[PDB]
Design a protein around this ligand. Sequence first.
Ligand SMILES: NC(=O)c1ccccc1O
Ligand SMILES: NC(=O)c1ccccc1O
Ligand SMILES: [Cl-]
Ligand SMILES: [Cl-]
Ligand SMILES: [Cl-]
Length: 163
Amino acid sequence: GAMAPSYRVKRMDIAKNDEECVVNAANPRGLPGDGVCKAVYKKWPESFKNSATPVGTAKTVMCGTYPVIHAVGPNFSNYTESEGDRELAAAYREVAKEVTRLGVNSVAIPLLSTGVYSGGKDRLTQSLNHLFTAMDSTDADVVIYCRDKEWEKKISEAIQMRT
Ligand SMILES: NC(=O)c1ccccc1O
Ligand SMILES: NC(=O)c1ccccc1O
Ligand SMILES: [Cl-]
Ligand SMILES: [Cl-]
Ligand SMILES: [Cl-]
């Protein structure tokens, strides 16, 4: 575990992270995808061997010895708000199990279901709160990656508020 487990946020490409493993915002079929998923495919293409996994789950594939945790958030275009909320919470609980199993001291994580899978809604708070619910009981250093300057400030505020 980390000596003093923390949350941090950085506004940069998750493919350039400084952590011991990465969470991919994957699609269920293990396809190259868009946004985070396409950056992860360019950086760690070997980790897409048999990465397909259902919505609400996470499947880890090694790229060399570097673990890529493929986490499948729901597409809110297809799910009801209620069922989508349930699957989004479940994906993050499976990420926490994988981070724990791997015995890593740090993890790079995007906000699941906030891009193409958001169904055109702002889900920063919804996705971040499910991330905290899952990861608060883990002792890894968590580093959240985002692109938007206003999202960086809002994620930083939410982290700082809890202390
Ligand atoms: N400003 C950027 O280029 C950037 C920042 C965060 C994530 C992906 C990116 O391409
Ligand atoms: N490559 C990225 O990390 C990125 C790309 C799109 C949106 C958010 C992100 O953090
Ligand atoms: Cl960058
Ligand atoms: Cl997304
Ligand atoms: Cl963002």
